[PDB]
């Protein structure tokens, strides 16, 4: 493998290199914030409305009380992550209807009133590209009761005690928060993040930004149209890359795929015998007497409890990773959007 092109900069003790032009670059950073909230019913997963299995399941103490407690803590933590990242502005700022900002063209990121969910064009592309599992946040029990075509994985999850809880903030609330942040950034600068929103023209705000990186502010005012055209071309290139390249959003797709695959594995674990004569509980209850079926039921209970414990432990580790990423996203929301950062590569 190649580590890169070989370079050798011309160093001398009286030689310097000074740039005579510049470029305006717009790049994209994608960070996961939350994941899917799930709830598991032990009594239906392990036993499946069998009274004998429930009576032998009460002998194992409070394992499912703490499994339920851990899953509830993860579920509240996801909503807390979204609240910390997005609900950072105090007031819902609106952009004035005259959309002139010095020649900078924000139509691809500001929302439009044509569609019901008031999302922008780039947000529309991002929501279309990341395909979802369409899990149980939307109710589907009326659809799962009606046998149409073939049985889905989601109906098999629902019929075995596994449920998906909807998030507290809906997608249009997140879009409202994002639009308020954009309106506060465009019309005020960084003043809305430290107190009241004080208006300033966008060219003068960009001159303040140029002063913040060690460039004298006349460079902006003598090159305003060129910088506006470069920003518009970079936004159009972001548009074209989002319409063409589909592998950029792999982190959120991995977040969706892991949560789908864990529930699929938890459903597929119900076909195992774990050393018993059958994975079907009614067959054990009908073929055998009391004591031998109690032994086989104990084997099945131990195996299913172990698989549920493995699922909950892996969910706790993934929730820790998601919380770290959401803390990073909240820091980047505070320091990049609401201010101007001197940290290199941040």
């Amino acid at each position: 493998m190649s580590l890169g092109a070989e370079n050798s900069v011309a160093y001398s003790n009286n030689s310097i290199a000074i740039p005579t032009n510049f470029t305006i670059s717009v790049t994209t950073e994608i960070l996961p914030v939350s994941m899917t909230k799930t709830s598991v019913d032990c009594t239906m997963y392990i036993c499946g409305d069998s009274t004998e299995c429930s009576n032998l399941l009460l002998q194992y103490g409070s394992f499912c009380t703490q499994l339920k407690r851990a899953l509830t803590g993860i579920a509240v933590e996801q909503d807390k992550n979204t609240q910390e990242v997005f609900a950072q502005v105090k007031q819902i700022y609106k952009t004035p209807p005259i959309k002139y900002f010095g020649g900078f063209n924000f139509s691809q990121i500001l929302p439009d009133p044509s569609k019901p969910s008031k999302r922008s064009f780039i947000e529309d592309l991002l929501f279309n590209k990341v395909t979802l599992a369409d899990a149980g946040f939307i109710k589907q029990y009326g659809d799962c009761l009606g046998d149409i075509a073939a049985r889905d994985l989601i109906c098999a999850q629902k019929f075995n005690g596994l449920t998906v809880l909807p998030p507290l903030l809906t997608d249009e609330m997140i879009a409202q928060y994002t639009s308020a942040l954009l309106a506060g950034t465009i019309t005020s600068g960084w003043t809305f993040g430290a107190g009241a929103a004080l208006q300033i023209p966008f060219a003068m705000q960009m001159a303040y930004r140029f002063n913040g990186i060690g460039v004298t502010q006349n460079v902006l005012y003598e090159n305003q149209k060129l910088i506006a055209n470069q920003f518009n071309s970079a936004i159009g290139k972001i548009q074209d890359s989002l319409s063409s390249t589909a592998s950029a959003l792999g982190k959120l797709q991995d977040v969706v795929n892991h949560n789908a695959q864990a529930l699929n594995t938890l459903v597929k674990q119900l076909s195992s015998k774990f050393g018993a004569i059958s994975s079907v509980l009614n067959d054990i209850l009908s073929r055998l007497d009391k004591v031998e079926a109690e032994v086989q039921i104990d084997r099945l209970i131990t195996g299913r409890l172990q698989s549920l414990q493995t699922y909950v432990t892996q969910q706790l580790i993934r929730a820790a990773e998601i919380r770290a990423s959401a803390n990073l996203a909240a820091t980047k929301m505070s320091e990049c959007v609401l201010g101007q950062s001197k940290r290199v590569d941040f």
């Binding site: 709830s39 046998d147 019929f159 076909s271």
Partner: protein, 366 residues
């Protein structure tokens, strides 16, 4: 569920509601014949061990309570089933295997045994489901001069595969010189005699052994025990009994295209999704009846004892085990107002609940 006499403000997952079954359905094939167990367990002479007789039992109703009346044994030793549950569920075919051994080799009539009978005469498979019935026969299969009518094979080239028979009598050779049909030096006849005498010890008495071999249901059932059928109802959560397997669920008409040799349909979690009715050749979809989660929304008990109940994920024209419909389920006990406040108790997709004066009551809002 909190193990406390005082609760605080919030939403708590308490339990799950389940629709209970109303009726019971038993679906068994319409078979009126009786299985010939009397001709198996009550015979004058049984065959030898190397030439054991297999009897196929089918197209009849089997009652296992007369086995104790027909033969005087102690233990109805079964392996894949239990003796007391044989009259409820049912099978495809039953085979009966009858022979007479000594008392030492009764323990070798078992799955996973080696020796003389288990290796050269009668081998049971590892996945054998069935019952082995053995009883003493010192007054029927013994003589004072020695009973030579029962033969055993103790010399063979290789071990016997399960449920195989060997009837051929050839002179066994254990050396380089061929026998050529002459029982001389290094030549032995593989059929040797028991030689039963009543004066022998308790471990050498003849034992009449009947091996009942059941096979689980893969083909449509020909032998089923005594159980009256019940008329079939649909679109109700009931308890069903389709050819021995139980369950609880709702049976509807099915659009699944079964091949004619198929009698069931399994799911990914290895559960019977569709069933074929044994009386009328019809396909029925099995789905469980309505269920879900129940969350109780309360303020503290210091404030009030009023609660609201959220039935999670259901569309509550199907609620039972004001009314406002959310996307997390539907809400009973809270009145939806057209006002917006800060969130107090989070319910679901943009819906919160609070305790507001405007008498005190629980309201829900966006």
């Amino acid at each position: 569920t909190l193990k406390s006499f005082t609760v605080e403000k919030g939403i708590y997952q308490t339990s799950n509601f389940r629709v209970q079954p109303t009726e019971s359905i038993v679906r068994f094939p319409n078979i009126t014949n009786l299985c010939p167990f009397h001709e198996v367990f009550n015979a004058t002479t049984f065959a030898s061990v190397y030439a054991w007789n297999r009897k196929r039992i089918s197209n009849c109703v089997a009652d296992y309570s007369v086995i104790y009346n027909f033969a005087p044994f102690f233990a109805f030793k079964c392996y894949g089933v239990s003796p007391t549950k044989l009259n409820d569920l049912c099978f495809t075919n039953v085979y009966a295997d009858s022979f007479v051994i000594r008392g030492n080799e009764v323990s070798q009539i078992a799955p996973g045994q080696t020796g003389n009978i288990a290796d050269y005469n009668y081998k049971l498979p590892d996945d054998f489901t069935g019952c082995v019935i053995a009883w003493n026969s010192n007054k029927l299969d013994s003589k004072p001069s020695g009973n030579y009518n029962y033969l055993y094979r103790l010399f063979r080239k290789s071990k016997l595969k399960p449920f195989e028979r060997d009837i051929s009598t050839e002179i066994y050779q254990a050396g380089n010189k061929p026998c050529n049909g002459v029982a001389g030096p290094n030549c032995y006849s593989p059929l040797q005699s028991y030689g039963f005498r009543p004066t022998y010890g308790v471990g050498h008495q003849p034992y009449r052994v009947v091996v009942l071999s059941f096979e689980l249901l893969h083909a449509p059932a020909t032998v089923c025990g005594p159980k009256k059928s019940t008329n079939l109802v649909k679109n109700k959560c009931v308890n069903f009994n389709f050819n021995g397997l139980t369950g609880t669920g709702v049976l509807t008409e099915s659009n699944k295209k079964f091949l004619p040799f198929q009698q069931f349909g399994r799911d990914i979690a290895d559960t019977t999704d569709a069933v074929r009715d044994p009386q009328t050749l019809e396909i029925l979809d099995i789905t469980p009846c309505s269920f879900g989660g129940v969350s109780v929304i309360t303020p503290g008990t210091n404030t009030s004892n009023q609660v609201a109940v959220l039935y999670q994920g259901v569309n509550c024209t199907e609620v039972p085990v004001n009314v406002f419909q959310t996307r997390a389920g539907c809400l009973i006990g809270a009145e939806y107002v057209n006002n917006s406040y800060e969130c107090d108790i989070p319910i679901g997709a943009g819906i919160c609940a609070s305790y507001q004066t405007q008498s005190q009551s629980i309201i829900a809002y966006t």
